[model samples]
Target: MNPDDIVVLVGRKKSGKSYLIKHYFIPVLKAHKISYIIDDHNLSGSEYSKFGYNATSLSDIVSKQYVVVYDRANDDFFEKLWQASKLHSKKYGTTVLIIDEAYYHFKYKQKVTPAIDEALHANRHAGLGLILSTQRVYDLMPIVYKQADLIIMFYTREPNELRWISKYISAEAAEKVKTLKQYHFLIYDVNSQTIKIHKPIL
Candidate 1:
């Protein structure tokens, strides 16, 4: 996703979203040399710190660039993130923020929620790439859908969500998801207007 592209991952529980992030996405970020900050998951100790760089406290996020992890229900995490994201533009490694369950930080109908919302409105301009994942596609505000450069959607049977996705992505891409096997996901490259169906990596 470069260091600037806005990406959204949509799927149900146990549908390989976490698997994709651990084995695919994070590895890719390491490959890209884009240090990341994840606001979901335990992120403590060395369990998911295989990238060889981990930051326990965000107090030094601006000074020391590395992967910062957080628990989902951290009441003030979003507030702390706003300060970091605003100051974190084109750093030495140019970090990316990956929120596993964005639904926690952002409200669907609310115009504003927190830095997560602030980041989406000013994405590349801030030089902070954002990758947000959620169980329901509709839980994110509309701006996120419209601005996402790419979308990775796992098998979803919610007709209402499919309809919602069709409006922002495409009718064909939305309808195409119905045929996806479990763990298989549909990739909709919004910028290129291309679609690809990929099977789960074994």
Candidate 2:
């Protein structure tokens, strides 16, 4: 993925978002030696055995094959992370911050973090990228959509439904989204204004 890329993953539980991250994203990131980090903010005991840190700057970041994992980061944490990524750009290559349950960090109706806006705006030329995943899409900050370069959507059963998806995809595409098979998802390239369905791994 490009350093400027911001890929949004919208899906309800068990919708294959995390699966792709584990199987596809991590592999590609490792292959390219891209500096990556994660903010799962949950599942504290079940899935992973990696360590978590509350790093505050580019000098604070250090990793080999391990991606930095922040523990339940709040707005200040995000501000620092993005600011650090901004500097790491020239020092390291691109830093991809993968945020799962992103709504927890950036909520709608909650105050918008100005630094959040600033970091997003500078993504393209700053050698930074993000992978934001959330089940409650509308519960996220509005800036989330405005800056999304790509969106990967999976079938959802939440109350809001996938109706709002029409804003980015064709009505016909939205219709097709309703019945995506388990683990299968729709990849929408906001830049190209194109959509493709991705099948599950297993």
Candidate 3:
């Protein structure tokens, strides 16, 4: 896969979005012998332990490896992370940035798009893969909808919330958002231009 590819996982709170990333995705990357960094605030010791990356600051993580997992970051800190990620790519080869609980960092609460935008727009071609995982997809602005190479929506059972997503995806895909099992998810792939349902770790 190209380093510029972005993977977005969006879901409601407690929908096991973090679980998928840690158990399924993180382990797979680790098995590939990929080193990673975890940018976490409160979840470092608890939420991200099983993923194999030690909890550290963005400054610390960028100096280390290729694949990095960033979680539960506050708004004020995202800009710094964005800048450091670029430096990581420039200094090394490519850096894959995995972000979780990203709603607070990007949406109405703080709206730190410039930081988010820097991650998405500039460094993409320089070997940057941005993985954004969030709970409140509806609250996310239009730019997020446009930038994601793949949009993954986990069980957001609210009708209005589904309607909000329809503005980006299709109505048919939005309707399926409610029917999926609690941890199940829907994947919208920009490359394939297809949407499908995905089961969580078995």
Candidate 4:
């Protein structure tokens, strides 16, 4: 992926969004300087074991292959993680910031965090790329769609959701999005202005 790329993954619960990330992006992450997961779910027993760090110690962020899983389910933790990523960008330059269940961090709070918005806007130029995933498109902040370089849309059947997505994708693509099989997605490339279906291998 390009240094400026911001990829968003949208799907429903149990729709295989996380599985796709593990299967596809983990391999892509090999070339980056560092890796982080703003993990709110306390995911365990996998690649994270090697580099996982706690949010309470974000000041310790260094240039390495690390995954920062903020154990709490709140906006403050997400904010701090973004700050750490910003700091890392200035010093190390070029890292991956993956936020699974991103809607909770960006839209579930009483007030949306400006830090998150700022990071999304400027991180790319600073060499901090984002991989954000959410269960529903409507639940995410509008800025996410506006700035994303690639959008991986999984199955979504809601009409309102489809209507909202139509503004960004073609009606035909939206139709395809609604009928996608589990683990399958339509990847919309913003720069190329094209869409294609992708079925990730486990």
Candidate 5:
């Protein structure tokens, strides 16, 4: 598969989502020479490397497309990410942007919807692969599910709770995904449009 392909991994906290993506998924990308990283709760001004330069200032993300890791699911933060990614792609090249706790930043936050729409609508084909990981998939922004070329759902309780995820994926795909162990995942491939389960790096 192409590393530049957009992959969205969604699962709850401590459910091995981070460990899998950071270790397993990321390594897969690295093995292919694709650059990737993570973002945590700390915003721009906070102590974190995800945000480019000025965490608090918009000028910080003026024009750049560095692989970004965003934590706590902030809309404004992701907006900056989308904008920066677009700008970066315009000048330099593609940037794989991964946002953790996706449900919060994209779903719960009302202000972030437009930005998300813009980012995906504008740059998806340009090589902006967004991995939106979150536990509350049901509560995430509707557009994410709509825009997601592939949605990989990890283990979850309540069969009905995961029904939302089962829409695009097959019944078997959903069941197999629900049974994945910690740091394990099932990928919903966009290009080939197939479901393949694998154990993430633990």
Candidate 6:
């Protein structure tokens, strides 16, 4: 993904969102010069600590060459990260901001804080990329649907959800999403208005 891109991954719980990210995306990041920061609530234990960048708070997110895993679950934590990424990406050249279970931050309530809204809309100038993951399409804000450059959608058979997705994509394409296999997913490229299916890379 480019530094300017905003990618969203949506699927049902245990539908391979995190599995694909950990196995496929993380390795790609490791092969590149880009560094990242991950925000998630359940980021504890041996599996994550093995990555070696687990930090308890956003305060420890340095502009280092490696990724930092922030374990804070509050909105304030994401707000701080968005601000820091907007500032640091410009100074350090580029940074990737990853938010797992992203619905918690971008839900309908505040619909993404103003600072984050600014960064998501304008931070390409600062060389920042955002990767967001969630289970429900209704959980994220409308702006997220509008701004996302790439959307990786896993199996979701809910009728309302499919109808909602039809607003941006074709009805035929939205229907195709319902037939996806367990680990298969549809990748929608917003700019091209193209939809393609693929199995997990890992």
lDDT per model, in order? 0.75, 0.68, 0.66, 0.70, 0.59, 0.73
lDDT of 5 by residue, 120-157 (tens): 56545655666767776666655566666777777775
For model 3, the superposed segments whose C-alpha errors exceed 4 Å read 1-3, 44-46, 50-59, 66-76, 109-114
Question: What's the ranking of the predictions by lDDT, best on top?
Answer: 1, 6, 4, 2, 3, 5
The TM-score, computed over Cα atoms with residue i paired to residue i, of candidate 4 is 0.82
Model 1 bad stretches (over 4 Å): 41-56, 72-76, 86-90, 113-117
Residue 202, model 3, lDDT: 69
Instruction: Go through the candidates in order and give the C-alpha RMSD of each one to the true structure.
Output: 2.7, 3.0, 3.1, 2.9, 4.1, 2.2
User: Candidate 6, which segments miss by more than 4 Å at Cα?
Assistant: 44-47, 56-59, 73-75, 109-112
Model 2 off-target regions past 4 Å?
Answer: 43-58, 62-66, 73-75, 157-159, 168-170
Question: What is the TM-score of candidate 1?
Answer: 0.85
TM-score per model over all chains: 0.85, 0.83, 0.80, 0.82, 0.72, 0.88
lDDT score at residue 22, model 2, on the 0-100 scale: 81
The clash numbers for all candidates, in the given order, read: 0, 0, 0, 0, 9, 0
Candidate 5 CA-lDDT value: 0.59
Model 2 clash pairs?
A: none
The better-scoring model by TM-score among 1 and 2 is: 1
- Better-scoring candidate (TM-score), 3 or 4: 4
Give the C-alpha miss distance for residue 147 in model 1, angstroms. 1.2
Best by lDDT: 1
Give the winner by lDDT: 3 or 4. 4
Off by over 4 Å in 4: 31-34, 43-56, 73-76, 108-113
lDDT of 2 at 142: 60
Tens-place lDDT digits, model 6, residues 77-137: 6667777666556565777777787776787556456766765687576577788898887
> Model 1, range 29-148, lDDT digits (tens) per residue?
777777777665644364456543455565555555565565544566777875775565446546678777777776587656556656877766667778888888888876787888
Candidate 4 per-residue C-alpha lDDT over 115-169 given as tens digits, one digit per residue, 9 for 90 to 100:
7767668777656888888887878766677778898898888987898688755
Itemize residue pairs with steric clashes in candidate 6. Answer: none
